[PDB]
Amino acid sequence: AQTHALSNAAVMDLQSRWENMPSTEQQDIVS
């Protein structure tokens, strides 16, 4: 629904370590 200010632990986890994220919410966050 066009979320604004997507500022959760998800983005910090993204910048820190992307490869270790379990290849499943990657599509959700890029979407």
Binding site: T3, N8, A9, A10, M12, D13, M21, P22, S23
Partner: protein
């Protein structure tokens, strides 16, 4: 009085027991602290708290039913107790206010009040409790860089950095139907067996749980928080236990129950016991024991927790406990094993058959998710008498002998020698 399980979309289990008359129905989600990343820790805590406050206020005011919860590593045991003749209402409320809809629940005001309450609660837990703190630290130090070390409560930095979107995202990535069940421990028979599967009474978010990239590991470490302000001391050894669903669960449980608990300020505990308790009691060395062998679906922990009072005499307590563990893996009297078998039998009987339906419901949910089928205690008793000295010798020759340990305590630990005076003396050079 026999547990029944099936598989129709959502697993439904039932442990009928017309002994008690407090019917309980709820859910046992197969995810929790282990199924979530370090950066967003207390999401499960926040879920549990928003539920336990506002839904409690709703249910008691409307009807008569008191709702509880529990999170240990990978459960959200949202058990909703009720009367024996009031299970349909409980199920209807659970499916109308937990799975959906979440709009009337996650108002910004209620969420924020619960957020500040959770912050206060975790803060005073950090400032007051101690054995639980060292246990959580032991988990956090045994499983570094692994989705099992993060605690079941969370860190203030991780607590503060989440408002709505993270909560809803975790809800939609873990409140599915594939790994969620229904538990009806109490005195219901088959109404729950048919009413869970109805025209619409079903959890939303069809799909599967996102599989974790890495499961679990182990490595020796220390996390001590030396502060002389606190009066007493606190330590907690640990050796990697045996995971659930393995032919080593009960033998490890017995190997833990041999040494047993101990409370130095009780007239009915000092007199009884085995070698270490006597050799401690001659002087004053320790004040509490807790031999615990906790197990999880990824890996288990065999631990040894104390909270002493003497400060100069930590080394001797550790040395004696280690020599006793070596004695366990080198030679055990038959009477010791028989006594352990009897004690563990009665302990299991008390734990699994306590009158409170909530405990039985939570344990049934844990087993049905992990084992895939409930293990009635009859088979446990049948297979527990077969445990013999040779088996325990063999098991301890693997889990205990020269295996890396992890300890973590807060208080006046300073007297404790760092690593090679508590590790390289598990064999005493004469086996």
């Amino acid at each position: 009085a026999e547990v029944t399980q099936l598989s129709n979309g959502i697993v439904v289990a039932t442990e009928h027991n017309p002994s008690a008359h407090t019917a309980s129905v709820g859910v046992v989600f197969g995810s929790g602290a282990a199924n979530e990343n370090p950066y967003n820790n207390g999401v499960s805590n926040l879920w549990k708290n928003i539920f336990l406050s506002k839904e409690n206020s709703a249910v008691a005011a409307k009807e008569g039913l008191a709702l509880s919860s529990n999170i240990s590593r990978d459960f959200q045991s949202y058990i909703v107790s009720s009367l024996p003749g009031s299970t349909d209402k409980s199920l209807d409320f659970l499916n109308q206010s937990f799975i959906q809809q979440k709009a009337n629940l996650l108002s910004s005001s209620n969420f924020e009040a619960t957020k500040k309450s959770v912050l206060k609660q975790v803060q005073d837990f950090e400032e007051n409790d101690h054995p639980n703190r060292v246990l959580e630290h032991l988990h956090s130090t045994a499983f570094q860089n692994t989705p099992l070390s993060l605690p079941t409560r969370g860190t203030l930095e991780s607590l503060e950095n989440l408002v709505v979107a993270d909560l809803e995202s975790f809800a939609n990535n873990h409140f599915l139907n594939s790994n969620a069940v229904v538990v009806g421990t109490g005195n219901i028979k088959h109404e729950d067996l048919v009413n869970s599967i109805e025209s619409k009474n079903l959890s939303l978010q069809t799909g599967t749980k996102p599989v974790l990239k890495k499961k679990a590991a182990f490595l020796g470490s220390e996390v001590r928080l030396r502060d002389d302000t606190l009066p007493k001391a606190w330590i907690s050894l640990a050796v990697e236990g045996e995971p659930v669903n393995s032919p080593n669960y009960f033998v490890a449980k017995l190997a833990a129950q041999i040494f047993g608990s101990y409370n130095a300020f009780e007239p009915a505990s000092r007199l009884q016991g085995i070698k270490l308790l006597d050799n401690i009691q001659e002087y004053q060395l320790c004040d509490n024991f807790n031999h615990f062998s906790l197990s999880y679906k990824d890996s288990g922990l065999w631990g040894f927790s104390t909270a002493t009072r003497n400060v100069t005499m930590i080394d001797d307590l550790i040395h004696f406990t280690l020599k006793q563990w070596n004695r366990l893996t080198i030679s055990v009297t038959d009477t010791e094993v028989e006594r352990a078998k009897s004690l563990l039998k009665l302990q299991l009987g008390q734990l699994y058959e306590s009158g409170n339906p909530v405990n039985d419901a939570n344990l049934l949910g844990a087993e049905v998710l992990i084992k895939g089928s409930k293990l009635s205690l009859g088979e446990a008793f049948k297979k527990i008498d077969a445990i013999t000295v040779k088996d325990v010798k063999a098991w301890a020759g693997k889990r205990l002998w020269d295996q890396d340990i992890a300890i973590a305590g807060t208080g006046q630990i300073e007297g404790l020698l760092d690593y090679m005076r508590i590790r390289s003396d598990m064999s005493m050079m004469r086996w």
